[PDB]
Design a protein around this ligand. Sequence first.
Ligand SMILES: [Mg+2]
Ligand SMILES: [Zn+2]
Lengths: 129, 25, 221, 82, 220, 71, 102, 134
Amino acid sequence: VRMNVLADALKSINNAEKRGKRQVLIRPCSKVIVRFLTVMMKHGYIGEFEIIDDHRAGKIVVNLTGRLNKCGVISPRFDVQLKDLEKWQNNLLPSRQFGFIVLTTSAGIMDHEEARRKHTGGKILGFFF
Amino acid sequence: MRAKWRKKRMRRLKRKRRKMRQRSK
Amino acid sequence: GALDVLQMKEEDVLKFLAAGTHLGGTNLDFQMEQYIYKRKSDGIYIINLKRTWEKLLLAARAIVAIENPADVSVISSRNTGQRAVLKFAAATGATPIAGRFTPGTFTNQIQAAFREPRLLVVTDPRADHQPLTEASYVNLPTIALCNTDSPLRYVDIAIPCNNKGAHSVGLMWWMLAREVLRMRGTISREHPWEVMPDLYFYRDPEEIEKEEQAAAEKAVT
Amino acid sequence: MQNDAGEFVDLYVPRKCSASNRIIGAKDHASIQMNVAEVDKVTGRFNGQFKTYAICGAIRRMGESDDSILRLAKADGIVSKN
Amino acid sequence: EWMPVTKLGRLVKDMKIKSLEEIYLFSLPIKESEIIDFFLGASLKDEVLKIMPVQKQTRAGQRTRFKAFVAIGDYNGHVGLGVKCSKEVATAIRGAIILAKLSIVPVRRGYWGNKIGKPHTVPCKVTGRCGSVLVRLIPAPRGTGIVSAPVPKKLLMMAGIDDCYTSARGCTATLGNFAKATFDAISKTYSYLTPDLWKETVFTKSPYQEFTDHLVKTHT
Amino acid sequence: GKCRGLRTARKLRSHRRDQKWHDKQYKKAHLGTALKANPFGGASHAKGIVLEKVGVEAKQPNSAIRKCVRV
Amino acid sequence: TKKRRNNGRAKKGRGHVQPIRCTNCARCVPKDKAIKKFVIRNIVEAAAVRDISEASVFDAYVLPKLYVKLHYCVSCAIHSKVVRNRSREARKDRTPPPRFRP
Amino acid sequence: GRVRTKTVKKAARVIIEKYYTRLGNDFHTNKRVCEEIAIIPSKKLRNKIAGYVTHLMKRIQRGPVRGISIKLQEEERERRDNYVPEVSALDQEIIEVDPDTKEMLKLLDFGSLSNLQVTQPTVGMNFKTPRGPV
RNA sequence: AGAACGAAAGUCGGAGGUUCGAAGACGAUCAGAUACCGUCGUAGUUCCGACCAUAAACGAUGCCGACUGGCGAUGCGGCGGCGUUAUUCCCAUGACCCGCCGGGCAGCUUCCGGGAAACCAAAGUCUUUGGGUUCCGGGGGGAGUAUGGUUGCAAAGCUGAAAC
RNA sequence: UUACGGCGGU
Ligand SMILES: [Mg+2]
Ligand SMILES: [Zn+2]
């Protein structure tokens, strides 16, 4: 009984960083999390990761480094508009130097900055800082 | 006074006033 | 230890075998599976000696990093390794704390016996924990010649040899005092250091005067 | 710490661990900084330089300082490499 | 006319370790009260927060001890919080400053965004829990000011921080725990790995291995 | 645990509208029977005639006769 | 406060056990609360053996035993000293007491 | 009711540790020593010190009690520093090992360098002392 | 919404009646004993059938799912094995011995972490706050009572206020 | 074996 695969994948990384392990095993995989973890690899909180491509939902082995603090999720995937975006940013980010709420738009998965970069808002998906 | 004997002494009461209601209909 | 000068040097393996040193207990920890080769049929677990030699050369690469020779506080509680812990500090120039250790010595700076080192070597982590959890406070690197028995909480360069037997401890201080002077310029690697490993071994009780002079009626008498 | 002018307006640069990468605090009294003194290749004698390692207070107390400093060293020019 | 006994205090009476900034980076245990008075002397203010009469019950009559809550600080971020019991009020509140200059921590002043000048606020949002009191310090926009209860307002004007939001949860009339709870937050500005501090700390030579010469050169 | 999802707000707005009854202030100001209980009935002052000066003794740690009337 | 890690009784995965009754005060307890004490007392009370074994009708006679299982209630276990008020950091053991036969 | 107090036992340890060679196993000798060597106020605690002195003149004349005075300490070097024997209890080249540990020094590759006759240790796996108290 | 099962006591009918024993009858001890103790003893403890849904029904911990220390040990299977021991003078399974793997009641340890603390490998992953979903609680008394509903042969249960 | 009580505010 797995009512979100996103929520429990990012939970397990959050369980392992505070322990401090170099590698995790995200046990189910999808194209909703490999795009997601390539927002925290392209912006450089985690590193290399293999996808163990199996014929069912595969596995992902993520080389942690030690820069990630907490990478939780907002499991009601709330819609949020662009004026509605700033009032999140002082609720679940620490400060406006860093940190990223990452959200799916029709132009793709983006950060909060890349979503306010062009002019698009969509469903919020999670956060990491 | 115990609580299992606060109930019984008022369960003895809630049959008594549930009789004098039936007396004066 | 990746050298040709710092190899295993086959002479000592005939002493590693003959004084225990691959005779642990019968209970591996979760932080010492990497220091083992296999279990015997009688429950005993041997130790791939390339692993305990590469840690021994690494620990001497931590002792030479100390500048003061009179600063490495070498300590011992258990009886096997009380004779050795003294004259190891006479062979390297350290200060020995043999036997019972007063709590409030690394961090109680009022009384007389307050000593503050930069490094400390232990015989056993579990049974001599009192300097370890006092090394919790004075942010000090610790080394311990650990057995498969012992846990590894406050150790840093845990030596996976043996600690129970009398001969297994004294070799491992003799091997260390051989090595901690040979990474200095004391012994020049080819003229072999004659100092005998029986000097460090734990001493039997008082039949000694019976037997030392029973082989000395041809010296004095 | 890199203001908009670009200059260092900050107290001090804090250390970081070599194993668990988290920041060592200013009162974390179980964080050690040890030194591993290497030798020259000809004779195995101390030459004058060394190498450095820091192990923070928690990851020492968690048990695996040595499982750290074996491996960090293992890929960093200290013993066996196989 | 003061003489120490430890390594760190013996190696400061002839003025050889400068500027407390680095004994914070090597994470030393600080021992005496005179090292902290050596560097930051004539740059503290020593104002107390509460004196309460704690007491026990004995064979006859109540042993009335006393309590001193005191916070010391500069105006550029070196605060310390002491707690001490003693049998009399004054010998608690005198000896508490020795215990208050000793648990002294740095604090990192950061920015809210638009980092146009000197730092003014906390680097992020941090917590401090002490039993049941949690103090969530929040970064603040400029020109806002210290917004808190009275007893952390005496410390956030003592860490030099100009403007910082502050909320509290618990029984915040538990003055000493709510005094230590805000101290648990301001002591971990250098425990929160802000993502601009990623590059490898070049390990320099520690003061216990560079000052080995005077360790025994003149003393021993 | 609590009931979150982006279609649920009936569940939250129907779980709320009974659970607001159980504190004193929302029950005494909206059920209406506590608007009948005070003799003022939506007021603060209301006149009355004096019947008899009758005195009550104060509660436990004191001892004095507090003076009252019988409006 | 909770006194023990168990609830005072030696059962976990059940809901009901045998009800038995105590020895001296006959009081009903569950079988896994009560303080047992098995007794293997030498029935002749061995001080009185060199006064019967002359009067035994053999030479090498196995003197019998007596197998009485006292299992007290916990109310009369403490009052007749067969257990003792223990201390809060010497509670946590299930070691049986040492013998001292001589 | 005899047991001598600590200030007797503290002051009569520094006598025996510092003036051991001037003393011996006679009471009346030691009573004049402390008469001359330590400022004692009265006679009653004077000889009561000297009672513990002769009690430890018959004690440390045999055994090493907490008596870190140099004379016995100059003799322990005959025990711990001396006995450097003629042959080691390691180097007789006649040792026995197991068939697993000869694999352990076969990847260490000293098996061609070693004489090392091998005996299999016992067989049946009778270790792990029997569980359950009786 | 609604359903099934639900200790003991209770009611009702018929067998039943050994032991124990509400009530009650005495005998004691008591200032006074309608109680602790003793003999007697009804209803009941027993069965078959038809009821009531209440318990400290307690793990005082809702169900499901994942992740995150170890160590010896245990039960039901399955796997691989030195051997011993069983018709067996040989096998095939049996027993003990040494391991590992899954499920399960549990345990000892641990500055993982949490907490008001007792203490929890969950009460962990929670101000660094959102895996789903169900119920329920808002100072204490009044009170699980007054009433209305509905249920039951009855006892009462379910739903359940306010003044003060 | 038996063994009851202790006015109110300080
Ligand atoms: Mg009751
Ligand atoms: Zn009983």
